[PDB]
Amino acid sequence: VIESPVDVVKELVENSLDAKATKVEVEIVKGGKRLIRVKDNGTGIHPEDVEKVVLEALYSISSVSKFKLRSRFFQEKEGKEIEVEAGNILGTRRVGMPVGTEVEVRDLFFNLPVRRKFLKKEDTERRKVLELIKEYALTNPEVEFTLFSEGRETLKLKKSSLKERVEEVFQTKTEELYAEGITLRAFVSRNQQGKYYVFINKRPIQNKNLKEFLRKVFGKTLVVLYAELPPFFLELVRELAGKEK
Ligand SMILES: Nc1ncnc2c1ncn2[C@@H]1O[C@H](COP(=O)(O)OP(=O)(O)CP(=O)(O)O)[C@@H](O)[C@H]1O
Ligand SMILES: [Mg+2]
């Protein structure tokens, strides 16, 4: 589950979206090797449940870091903070905060020196996190996402339509394409540096068989393909590639 800082971000941002956050703020320092912080405005965790959820994903994260989670439940005036180091609860505290949850993961794998030493360079880890937040942004257009890395605001995306969200992410104008129990919706831009993104139902799909086929029927083309299927095609993708101008 947790091999590097991007895995941590993934789990925290999933938790935020699970909690109906409309704003998710991510901050990384030293590529996430020093700090990973994820803050959301979702419904929070009741004080009675804060100690439980550390012990699943949070337990596995808290076991390999210096870990704080603070949360204010939508029904409570104050929040509660739990502090954990390598699985060992150091204590809890009442904290003033906004409704929502904020998790801080520091010194990832400090207890596992070889694993820390073999982590990729800061800039490599940074890009993985950037790509992951883009991925989440592309399927959550109603959600605001911000990314700070080494104190710079690297990504800021406000709530918008889906087409507006695509164009903000890829910094380009797209044409929207649609086809047909299968439904396909794609945003393409033809000049670019080819990039081929595939989402099936709501999830990002990395398959090499589909990508190279998108490169085949579409152009250096940006293709962002949202596919919906029943609990399980390529000729419909070829049909889709025939609608542009
Ligand atoms: N940002 C957040 N907002 C609200 N609740 C949160 C939260 N982060 C964690 N939680 C609560 O903590 C619980 C445990 O989170 P954790 O990620 O460890 O397990 P999970 O229930 O999400 C299953 P998994 O992550 O393995 O799919 C969640 O079920 C949720 O109740
Ligand atoms: Mg989770």
Short mmCIF file of C-alpha atoms and ligand atoms in Angstrom, two decimals:
data_model
loop_
_atom_site.label_atom_id
_atom_site.label_comp_id
_atom_site.label_asym_id
_atom_site.label_seq_id
_atom_site.Cartn_x
_atom_site.Cartn_y
_atom_site.Cartn_z
CA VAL A 1 0.00 0.00 0.00
CA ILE A 2 2.58 2.65 0.99
CA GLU A 3 5.88 2.70 -0.93
CA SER A 4 6.38 6.41 -1.52
CA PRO A 5 4.85 9.83 -0.84
CA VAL A 6 2.46 9.65 -3.80
CA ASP A 7 0.83 6.56 -2.24
CA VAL A 8 0.26 8.60 0.92
CA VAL A 9 -1.30 11.48 -1.02
CA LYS A 10 -3.50 9.02 -2.88
CA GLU A 11 -4.91 7.57 0.32
CA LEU A 12 -5.46 10.89 1.98
CA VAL A 13 -7.13 12.53 -1.02
CA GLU A 14 -9.36 9.50 -1.49
CA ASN A 15 -10.41 9.85 2.17
CA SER A 16 -11.18 13.52 1.62
CA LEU A 17 -13.35 12.81 -1.40
CA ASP A 18 -15.02 9.95 0.48
CA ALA A 19 -15.89 12.56 3.12
CA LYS A 20 -17.61 14.82 0.52
CA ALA A 21 -14.95 17.49 0.55
CA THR A 22 -15.47 20.26 -2.01
CA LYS A 23 -12.02 21.69 -1.40
CA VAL A 24 -8.86 19.60 -1.05
CA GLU A 25 -5.53 21.26 -0.30
CA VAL A 26 -2.31 19.25 -0.67
CA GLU A 27 1.14 20.40 0.43
CA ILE A 28 4.41 18.52 -0.04
CA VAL A 29 7.89 19.35 1.18
CA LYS A 30 11.01 17.60 -0.15
CA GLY A 31 8.77 15.74 -2.59
CA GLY A 32 6.69 14.49 0.32
CA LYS A 33 9.71 12.92 1.97
CA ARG A 34 9.76 15.63 4.63
CA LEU A 35 6.08 16.60 4.81
CA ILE A 36 2.82 15.52 3.21
CA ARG A 37 -0.20 17.54 4.32
CA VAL A 38 -3.78 17.05 3.11
CA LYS A 39 -6.56 19.38 4.24
CA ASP A 40 -10.17 19.15 3.37
CA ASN A 41 -13.49 20.77 4.13
CA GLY A 42 -15.50 17.53 4.35
CA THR A 43 -17.71 16.41 7.23
CA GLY A 44 -14.84 15.53 9.56
CA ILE A 45 -14.53 12.82 12.18
CA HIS A 46 -16.39 12.89 15.50
CA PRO A 47 -14.03 13.26 18.49
CA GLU A 48 -15.16 9.83 19.69
CA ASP A 49 -13.95 8.26 16.39
CA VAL A 50 -10.59 10.06 15.96
CA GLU A 51 -8.55 7.55 17.99
CA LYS A 52 -10.25 4.60 16.28
CA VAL A 53 -9.41 5.40 12.66
CA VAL A 54 -5.67 5.26 13.34
CA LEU A 55 -6.42 1.64 14.39
CA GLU A 56 -6.42 0.05 6.91
CA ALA A 57 -4.87 2.98 5.12
CA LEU A 58 -4.32 5.47 7.99
CA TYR A 59 -2.86 2.80 10.27
CA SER A 60 -0.46 1.76 7.53
CA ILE A 61 0.53 5.38 6.94
CA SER A 62 0.92 6.22 10.67
CA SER A 63 3.12 3.16 11.18
CA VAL A 64 5.86 4.52 8.87
CA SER A 65 5.77 8.24 9.78
CA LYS A 66 5.49 10.98 12.33
CA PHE A 67 1.77 11.39 11.90
CA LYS A 68 -0.80 13.94 12.97
CA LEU A 69 -4.48 13.89 12.14
CA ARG A 70 -6.78 16.67 13.28
CA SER A 71 -10.49 16.72 12.54
CA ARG A 72 -13.53 18.77 13.43
CA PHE A 73 -16.85 17.03 12.96
CA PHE A 74 -19.56 19.07 11.28
CA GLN A 75 -21.61 18.71 14.51
CA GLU A 76 -18.80 19.94 16.83
CA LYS A 77 -17.43 23.38 17.68
CA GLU A 78 -13.88 22.12 18.27
CA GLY A 79 -11.61 19.65 16.62
CA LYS A 80 -9.46 16.90 18.01
CA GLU A 81 -5.86 16.01 17.04
CA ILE A 82 -4.15 12.63 17.41
CA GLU A 83 -0.38 12.28 17.16
CA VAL A 84 1.28 8.97 16.25
CA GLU A 85 4.87 7.93 15.63
CA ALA A 86 5.51 4.59 13.90
CA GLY A 87 2.22 3.18 15.16
CA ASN A 88 2.62 4.45 18.74
CA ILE A 89 0.03 6.98 19.91
CA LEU A 90 1.79 9.90 21.57
CA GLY A 91 -1.41 11.62 22.64
CA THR A 92 -4.44 13.65 21.68
CA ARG A 93 -5.42 17.27 22.00
CA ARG A 94 -8.39 19.58 21.60
CA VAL A 95 -7.73 22.00 18.74
CA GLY A 96 -9.49 25.04 17.28
CA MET A 97 -9.94 24.53 13.53
CA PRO A 98 -12.49 24.79 10.72
CA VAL A 99 -14.84 21.90 10.08
CA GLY A 100 -12.95 19.30 8.08
CA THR A 101 -9.86 17.13 8.43
CA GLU A 102 -6.18 17.83 8.12
CA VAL A 103 -3.55 15.07 8.04
CA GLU A 104 0.21 15.67 8.31
CA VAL A 105 2.64 12.90 7.48
CA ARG A 106 6.26 13.72 8.31
CA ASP A 107 9.58 11.97 7.82
CA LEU A 108 8.11 9.10 5.79
CA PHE A 109 9.95 5.80 6.48
CA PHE A 110 12.15 7.45 9.17
CA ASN A 111 11.90 4.02 10.92
CA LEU A 112 12.98 2.20 7.72
CA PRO A 113 16.26 3.79 6.71
CA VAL A 114 16.97 1.59 3.70
CA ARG A 115 13.50 2.23 2.33
CA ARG A 116 13.97 5.98 2.88
CA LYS A 117 17.36 5.90 1.17
CA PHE A 118 15.93 4.22 -1.94
CA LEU A 119 13.13 6.75 -2.45
CA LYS A 120 13.44 8.61 -5.72
CA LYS A 121 14.86 12.14 -5.94
CA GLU A 122 12.62 14.97 -4.67
CA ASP A 123 11.79 16.21 -8.15
CA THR A 124 10.71 12.74 -9.34
CA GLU A 125 8.39 12.30 -6.36
CA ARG A 126 7.04 15.80 -6.94
CA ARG A 127 5.92 14.99 -10.49
CA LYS A 128 4.21 11.76 -9.39
CA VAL A 129 2.19 13.77 -6.87
CA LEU A 130 1.39 16.41 -9.48
CA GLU A 131 0.17 13.76 -11.92
CA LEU A 132 -1.96 12.13 -9.20
CA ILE A 133 -3.67 15.39 -8.29
CA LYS A 134 -4.35 16.08 -11.97
CA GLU A 135 -5.88 12.60 -12.15
CA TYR A 136 -8.17 13.32 -9.25
CA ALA A 137 -8.95 16.79 -10.64
CA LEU A 138 -10.02 15.28 -13.94
CA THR A 139 -12.67 13.07 -12.34
CA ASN A 140 -13.81 15.59 -9.70
CA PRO A 141 -14.62 18.82 -11.56
CA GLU A 142 -16.99 19.94 -8.77
CA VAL A 143 -14.03 19.75 -6.30
CA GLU A 144 -11.42 22.44 -5.83
CA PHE A 145 -7.82 21.22 -5.72
CA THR A 146 -4.70 23.06 -4.74
CA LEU A 147 -1.12 21.75 -4.60
CA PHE A 148 1.81 23.46 -2.86
CA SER A 149 5.29 21.96 -3.39
CA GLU A 150 8.35 23.40 -1.64
CA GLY A 151 6.28 26.47 -0.72
CA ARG A 152 5.14 27.25 -4.27
CA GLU A 153 1.54 26.98 -5.41
CA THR A 154 2.07 24.54 -8.27
CA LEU A 155 -1.57 23.65 -8.99
CA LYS A 156 -4.80 25.53 -8.41
CA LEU A 157 -8.09 24.35 -9.93
CA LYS A 158 -11.49 25.83 -9.03
CA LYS A 159 -14.85 24.07 -9.40
CA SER A 160 -16.05 24.05 -13.01
CA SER A 161 -17.69 22.01 -15.66
CA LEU A 162 -15.91 18.93 -16.84
CA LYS A 163 -14.78 20.47 -20.11
CA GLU A 164 -13.53 23.57 -18.28
CA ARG A 165 -11.64 21.32 -15.84
CA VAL A 166 -9.94 19.41 -18.63
CA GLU A 167 -8.87 22.60 -20.32
CA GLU A 168 -7.54 24.09 -17.07
CA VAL A 169 -5.52 20.93 -16.38
CA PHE A 170 -3.96 20.60 -19.85
CA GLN A 171 -3.80 24.35 -20.65
CA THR A 172 -5.39 23.92 -24.04
CA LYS A 173 -8.69 24.15 -25.89
CA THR A 174 -10.41 20.83 -26.56
CA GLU A 175 -13.20 19.54 -28.75
CA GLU A 176 -15.75 17.31 -26.99
CA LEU A 177 -16.68 13.99 -28.69
CA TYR A 178 -19.48 11.56 -27.73
CA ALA A 179 -20.58 8.06 -28.75
CA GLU A 180 -23.46 5.74 -27.69
CA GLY A 181 -24.92 0.22 -23.03
CA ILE A 182 -21.49 1.79 -23.50
CA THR A 183 -21.01 5.57 -23.40
CA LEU A 184 -17.84 7.46 -24.36
CA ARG A 185 -16.98 11.12 -23.82
CA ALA A 186 -13.63 12.49 -24.97
CA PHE A 187 -11.83 15.83 -25.06
CA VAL A 188 -9.21 16.06 -27.80
CA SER A 189 -6.64 18.71 -28.75
CA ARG A 190 -4.52 18.02 -31.81
CA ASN A 191 -1.33 20.03 -31.80
CA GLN A 192 0.52 19.78 -28.45
CA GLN A 193 3.39 16.13 -27.13
CA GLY A 194 0.95 13.24 -27.10
CA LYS A 195 -0.96 12.53 -23.89
CA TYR A 196 -3.62 9.81 -23.61
CA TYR A 197 -5.74 9.61 -20.46
CA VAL A 198 -8.41 6.96 -19.88
CA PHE A 199 -11.05 6.84 -17.17
CA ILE A 200 -13.40 3.84 -17.04
CA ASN A 201 -16.44 4.48 -14.89
CA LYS A 202 -14.77 6.87 -12.40
CA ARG A 203 -11.27 5.42 -12.21
CA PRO A 204 -7.95 6.14 -13.98
CA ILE A 205 -6.89 3.27 -16.27
CA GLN A 206 -3.24 2.83 -17.31
CA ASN A 207 -3.61 0.08 -19.95
CA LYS A 208 -1.04 0.09 -22.76
CA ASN A 209 -3.43 -1.65 -25.16
CA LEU A 210 -5.94 1.20 -25.00
CA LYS A 211 -3.41 4.05 -25.01
CA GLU A 212 -1.54 2.97 -28.12
CA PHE A 213 -4.92 2.46 -29.76
CA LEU A 214 -5.87 6.03 -28.85
CA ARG A 215 -2.58 7.19 -30.36
CA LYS A 216 -3.58 5.08 -33.39
CA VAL A 217 -7.10 6.38 -34.15
CA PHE A 218 -6.62 9.89 -32.75
CA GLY A 219 -3.52 11.85 -33.72
CA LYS A 220 0.66 14.56 -31.23
CA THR A 221 -2.85 14.62 -29.77
CA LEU A 222 -4.22 15.13 -26.27
CA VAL A 223 -7.01 12.57 -25.73
CA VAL A 224 -8.93 12.43 -22.48
CA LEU A 225 -11.41 9.61 -22.63
CA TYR A 226 -14.17 9.02 -20.10
CA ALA A 227 -15.68 5.59 -20.60
CA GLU A 228 -18.73 4.20 -18.81
CA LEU A 229 -19.48 0.47 -18.96
CA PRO A 230 -21.67 -1.94 -17.03
CA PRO A 231 -19.62 -4.34 -14.89
CA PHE A 232 -17.91 -5.85 -17.97
CA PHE A 233 -15.53 -1.21 -27.17
CA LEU A 234 -12.50 -0.31 -29.29
CA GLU A 235 -14.53 -0.02 -32.48
CA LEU A 236 -16.75 2.49 -30.68
CA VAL A 237 -13.55 4.36 -29.83
CA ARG A 238 -12.68 4.28 -33.54
CA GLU A 239 -16.19 5.58 -34.27
CA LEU A 240 -15.61 8.38 -31.71
CA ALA A 241 -12.37 9.32 -33.47
CA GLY A 242 -14.42 10.13 -36.60
CA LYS A 243 -16.32 13.03 -35.11
CA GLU A 244 -14.44 16.30 -35.07
CA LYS A 245 -14.92 18.97 -37.73
N1 LIG B 1 -10.46 13.22 5.51
C1 LIG B 1 -11.40 12.49 6.18
N2 LIG B 1 -12.64 12.94 6.39
C2 LIG B 1 -13.57 12.22 7.05
N3 LIG B 1 -13.38 10.99 7.51
C3 LIG B 1 -12.15 10.42 7.36
C4 LIG B 1 -11.09 11.14 6.66
N4 LIG B 1 -10.00 10.35 6.65
C5 LIG B 1 -10.33 9.22 7.29
N5 LIG B 1 -11.62 9.26 7.67
C6 LIG B 1 -12.30 8.19 8.44
O1 LIG B 1 -11.28 7.28 8.76
C7 LIG B 1 -11.67 5.96 8.35
C8 LIG B 1 -10.43 5.16 8.04
O2 LIG B 1 -9.76 5.72 6.92
P1 LIG B 1 -8.83 4.68 6.15
O3 LIG B 1 -8.40 5.30 4.83
O4 LIG B 1 -7.75 4.10 7.01
O5 LIG B 1 -9.83 3.44 5.81
P2 LIG B 1 -10.96 3.52 4.69
O6 LIG B 1 -12.35 3.22 5.44
O7 LIG B 1 -11.10 4.76 3.90
C9 LIG B 1 -10.88 2.04 3.68
P3 LIG B 1 -9.60 2.19 2.43
O8 LIG B 1 -8.91 3.50 2.56
O9 LIG B 1 -8.57 0.99 2.71
O10 LIG B 1 -10.37 2.02 1.01
C10 LIG B 1 -12.59 6.20 7.17
O11 LIG B 1 -13.51 5.11 6.99
C11 LIG B 1 -13.30 7.45 7.56
O12 LIG B 1 -14.40 7.09 8.44
MG MG B 2 -9.36 5.41 2.98
#
